[PDB]
């Protein structure tokens, strides 16, 4: 079921066998964070191509109670061995996305596990074992794969062959079809181990070292030192108001918050709801607006510990006005360039504008 209503809780997840599990947490009196944690493990098992403890995330929570809003930033970090031009070949040319995509250098230190643990105790009021067990059952005893997972495996036959994954996702010759049962005994092993010795099995354990092995085996420079150094952060949201509402979204090192808000700010003054939703007018104004914001992102997005991002300027009322000049019903803007938000924020860039190519997270 795709829609639903609740009084004492609610949960909506990418996979029905994740949902479903979060709901059980709430039914037992556990809170949203408890449930969120449970869901992430469940998704890791049931939607393994999408999210995982071998990756990162941003967890936005609104507190109780405290009534403040915060964000567990568990995005991966590059190992100390990584290099600014590690993605160029020996001729100084960018290495094809398909190739970069799989290389050891691509793998950043996974942060999700520490982030779940951070959230748990900041908020969590259950575990340190209950929330991971149901995912261990699905890993150990398996489950039938849905359309989307089936099609991931088919669309990525060639990547999946190259790796240890082929034994279990490409069992004999071919890739599991909808309904086939996916069992991840080794993943269950790891999850049981996470339950017992906590996170440190990961960042100070055999798994951490295991990962360091493979990243190097595939050309990467990850050491267990890198893992042991890794730290999640907490971020306070980027805010903004629109149609009389306060929106809390992601700050750098995500591009999401700023430019989604900027997109709204730009589009607001046009009052699109005059136009039919599926009208030329609309799509064009949306399109033109996207072009501007995405151009700004290409020049000025990045981890603020390392760079200065003009958050004030990018969302300035006067910047919006300047840029809305570009957006008309009477033409498509051909000169798609970044704006100068520095004219509105004290400071200047500690970086240049490098034009870039094509990143196959597409077809």
């Amino acid at each position: 079921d795709k829609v639903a209503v609740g009084k004492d809780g609610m949960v909506a997840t990418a996979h029905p066998l994740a949902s479903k599990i979060g709901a059980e947490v709430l039914k037992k009196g556990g809170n949203a964070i408890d449930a969120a944690i449970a869901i992430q493990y469940a998704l890791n098992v049931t939607e393994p191509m999408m999210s995982g403890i071998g990756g990162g995330g941003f967890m936005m929570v609104y507190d109780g109670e405290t009534k403040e809003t915060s964000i567990i930033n568990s995005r991966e970090r590059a190992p100390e061995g990584a290099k600014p031009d590690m993605f160029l070949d020996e001729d100084g040319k960018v290495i094809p996305f398909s190739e970069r995509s799989r290389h050891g250098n691509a793998v950043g230190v996974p942060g999700t596990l520490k982030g779940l643990e951070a959230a748990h105790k900041k908020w969590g009021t259950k575990k340190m074992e209950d929330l991971i067990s149901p995912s261990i059952k699905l890993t150990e005893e398996g489950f039938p794969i849905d359309s989307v997972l089936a099609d991931a495996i088919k669309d990525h036959q060639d990547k999946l062959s190259k790796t240890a994954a082929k034994d279990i996702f490409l069992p004999d010759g071919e890739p599991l079809k909808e309904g086939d049962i996916l069992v991840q005994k080794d993943m269950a092993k790891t999850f049981k181990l996470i339950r017992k010795e906590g996170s440190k099995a990961f960042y100070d354990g055999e798994i951490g070292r295991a990962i360091a092995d493979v990243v190097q085996d595939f050309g990467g420079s990850m050491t267990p030192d890198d893992l042991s150094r890794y730290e999640v952060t907490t971020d306070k949201p980027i805010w903004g108001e629109y149609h009389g509402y306060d929106i809390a979204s992601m700050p750098p090192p995500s591009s999401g918050g700023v430019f989604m808000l900027q997109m709204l700010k730009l589009i607001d003054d046009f009052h699109l709801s005059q136009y039919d939703p599926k009208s030329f007018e609309k799509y064009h104004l949306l399109a033109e607006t996207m072009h501007l914001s995405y151009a700004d992102r290409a020049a000025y997005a990045g981890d603020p510990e390392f760079v200065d991002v003009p958050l004030r300027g990018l969302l300035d009322p006067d910047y919006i006005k300047e840029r809305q000049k570009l957006i008309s019903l009477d033409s498509m803007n051909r000169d798609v360039k970044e704006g100068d938000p520095w004219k509105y924020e004290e400071g200047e860039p500690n970086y240049e504008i490098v034009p870039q190519p094509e990143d196959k997270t597409i077809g």
Partner: protein
Amino acid sequence: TTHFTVTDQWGNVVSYTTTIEQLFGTGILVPGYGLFLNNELTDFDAIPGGANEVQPNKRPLSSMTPTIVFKDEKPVLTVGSPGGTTIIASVFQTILNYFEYGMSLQDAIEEPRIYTNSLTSYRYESGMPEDVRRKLNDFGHKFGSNPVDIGNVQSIFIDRENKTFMGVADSSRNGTAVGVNI
């Protein structure tokens, strides 16, 4: 990338977008652990010298946009998508459909999206009428000859006036929403 959201009975709200980048990330399964490994670092720009160049210990730029909308200092809506760099676009368009067009929440999500990040990159969800696509492309756009499913919004609306929550999952995946009572 996936997004999922939770609301409880003590007024906590979770909007959580989490990923390993490409589907299966790098593709690499930590041997004898089953764990798939991210290629998140390939969110870094290739050609270095920008703000999103690779550096040691640097987190590569994300497009994840977990969001909560508030009416009068009190959360009312939760929004978040996956879909790589198109996430920004998905959330923004959902938000439009919900507040500017005042659409039903599910209708907001299911309303065709577009995404385009330069004059060379256009995508659209099935639903944009042909006459309209044709007229847009005459005007100078490059909407492909066939559409693609953009994003996967899950969102939870918090209904004070009826003291309930509504939850919805985008049909793009097999997402599901389930409430809790007692």
